[PDB]
From a paper:
The enzyme folds as a five-bladed β-propeller similar to those described for inverting GH43 enzymes of clan GH-F. Each blade is composed of a four-stranded antiparallel β-sheet repeated five times from the N-terminus to the C-terminus: blade 1, residues 14–59; blade 2, residues 69–120; blade 3, residues 125–179; blade 4, residues 190–244; blade 5, residues 255–306. The conserved catalytic nucleophile is placed on blade 4 (Glu195), the catalytic base (Asp17) on blade 1 and Asp126 on blade 3. The enzyme displays activity with pNP-αAraf as a substrate, but no detectable activity on pNP-αXyl or pNP-βXyl, which suggests that it is an α-1,5-l-arabinofuranosidase and not an α- or β-xylosidase.
The deposited model includes riding H atoms, and the asymmetric unit contains two protein molecules (molecule A, residues 4–315; molecule B, residues 3–315), three HEPES molecules (one associated with molecule A and two with molecule B), one sodium ion per protein molecule and 1032 water molecules. As inferred from homology to related GH43 enzymes, the catalytic −1 subsite is situated at the bottom of a pocket formed at the ‘top’ of the β-propeller. On one side of the −1 subsite, Trp72 (blade 2) forms a conserved sugar-binding platform. In the present structure, the piperazine ring of the HEPES buffer molecule is wedged between Trp72 and Tyr215 in subsite −1, but does not form a planar stacking interaction with the aromatic rings. A metal-binding site is situated at the central axis of the propeller, immediately below the −1 subsite. The imidazole group of the nearby His256 (blade 5) is positioned as a possible sixth ligand, but is 2.8 Å from the metal ion. The metal-binding site in the H. orenii GH43 glycosidase is strategically positioned at the propeller axis to provide stabilizing interactions between blade 2 (Glu75) and blade 5 (His256) across the axis, which probably explains the increase in melting temperature in the presence of divalent cations.
Author numbering: 4 to 315
Write the structure that this text describes.
């Protein structure tokens, strides 16, 4: 069995898991002044810290001053590509692209920043469709995005070039705060942390809304017929939300992976380490993710013993 939070990993946020060759690699917001830690597991339950996968102080890097957030790693063209964001010398948060021959690094910058529009961007997520076309989903961050008086984080999407170095065409708005559960009467509003999966020919974008430092941080999804949208939010959002009666606060900024035997999906998400006084100290959790009647569902959030991720 497992009991959340799995691995006892605290002082993090934004857990991204990649499965590769029967091992799992977790990358997270961690060393915020410097880079990103990686943890390894054979089973999604037992985790071992394996150092900085991306270190801005590594001799081949050097980019970014602070605010190293939300790394994601894909295996594409027979190597590993990491996206992340950090604050540049000009004060704007920007997305960067790095690569490595190994999931444990060292990752080396290949285009840092990946793009630059004089504004703040975070939470890049690269989705490779079944036909091999890459798409990047990313956040135009509330810090520098004010629309009709609201500081608002919006998720955009663009198709990428095959080499991942260019974002094609104009940015396409995917989603922005719009549903009642997303704090649409607040001065600051968020849709962030996109993660896209495909199921039965449709595309499902999981995302987080409300403030990361509130118990009300929570996960919803939207559905599209094509990766560039239109993206239509699930009416029953959020699909993963707090259970303060279980000490579960602010479930958010998730990734998705599969069990060791390939038979079932898990959502990997953070919650506040200290629900009595929430903030940036978050911890890693997993729970079962599945589709039923065309609805994406989570069995959770749990904090009691659950059957281990299915394995042979
Ligand atoms: Na992410």
């Amino acid at each position: 069995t497992y009991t959340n939070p799995v691995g006892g990993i605290t002082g993090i946020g934004d857990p991204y898991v990649l499965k590769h060759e029967s091992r799992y690699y977790l990358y997270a917001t961690s060393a915020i002044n410097r880079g990103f830690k990686v943890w390894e597991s054979p089973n999604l339950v037992d985790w071992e810290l394996k150092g900085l996968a991306l270190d801005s102080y590594y001799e081949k890097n050097g980019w970014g001053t602070e605010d190293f957030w939300a790394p994601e790693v894909i295996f594409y063209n027979n190597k590993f590509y990491m996206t992340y964001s950090a604050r540049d010398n000009d004060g704007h948060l920007k997305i960067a692209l790095a690569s490595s021959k190994s999931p444990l690094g060292p990752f080396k910058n290949i285009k840092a920043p990946l793009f630059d529009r004089g504004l703040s961007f975070i939470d890049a997520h690269i989705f490779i469709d079944q036909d091999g076309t890459p798409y990047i989903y990313y956040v135009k961050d509330c810090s520098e995005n004010i629309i009709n008086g609201i500081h608002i984080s919006q998720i955009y999407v663009q198709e990428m070039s095959q080499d991942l170095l260019e974002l094609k065409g104009d940015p396409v708005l995917a989603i922005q705060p719009s549903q009642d559960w997303e704090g649409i009467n607040d001065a600051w509003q968020w849709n962030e942390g996109p993660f896209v999966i495909k199921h039965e020919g449709k595309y499902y974008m999981m995302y987080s809304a409300n403030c990361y430092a509130s118990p009300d941080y929570s996960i919803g999804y939207a559905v599209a017929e094509t990766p560039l949208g239109p993206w239509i939010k699930y009416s029953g959002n959020p699909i993963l939300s707090k259970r303060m009666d279980k000490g579960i606060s602010g479930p958010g900024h998730n990734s998705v992976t599969v069990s060791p035997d390939g038979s079932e999906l898990f959502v990997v998400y953070h919650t506040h380490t200290y629900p009595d006084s929430p903030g940036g100290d978050r911890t890693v959790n997993i729970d079962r993710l599945y589709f039923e009647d065309g609805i994406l569902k989570v069995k959770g959030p749990t904090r009691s013993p659950q059957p281990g991720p299915r394995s042979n």
